[PDB]
Amino acid sequence: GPGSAVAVDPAPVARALREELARTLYCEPGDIDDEASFNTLGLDSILGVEFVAFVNQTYGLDEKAGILYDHPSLAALSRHVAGRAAPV
Numbered sequence: 001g002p003g004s005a006v007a008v009d010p011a012p013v014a015r016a017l018r019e020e021l022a023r024t025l026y027c028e029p030g031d032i033d034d035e036a037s038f039n040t041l042g043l044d045s046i047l048g049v050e051f052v053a054f055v056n057q058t059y060g061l062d063e064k065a066g067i068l069y070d071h072p073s074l075a076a077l078s079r080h081v082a083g084r085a086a087p088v
Contacts, residue, residue, distance in 0.1 A: 013085075014078035016058070021074075024051050034075045038068055059085040 014034060022029040025042045032041060043051065048065040056062060059081050071077040 010075075010079040010082040013059075013082045014074055017055075017074060017078055017081070020051060020054055032074065034073075036074055038072050043068060055081060060088075061085070 018029050018032045021027075021032050021038070021041065021043070024047055027041065038048070045065050048068045052063055052065050052067060061081070061084055063084075067077070067080070071080050
C-alpha cells in the first residue's frame with residue numbers, strides 16, 4: 001500500500017501486446033521480453049501495420065506502423081498506448 005511510488009497502468013497493456021506479438025511473429029510469449037526489440041523478434045512494416053491495426057481498435061487510437069520504430073520495445077510501446085488510451 002503506502003511507502004511506494006509504483007502503479008499498475010502499462011503492465012495490463014504489455015501482457016496484451018506480448019500475446020499479439022506471439023501470434024503475429026509465430027513465436028512463444030515467453031520468448032518476448034519487456035526490453036526486447038521488435039525488428040529482432042521478426043516484425044517489419046507489413047506485419048507491423050496489422051499489429052497497430054489491433055492497437056488502434058482496442059485502445060481507440062489512429063497511429064501508423066512508424067510508431068513501432070519510435071517505440072521498438074515492449075516497455076516503450078505499452079506506456080505510449082497506456083498514456084494515449086481513452087477513459088472508459
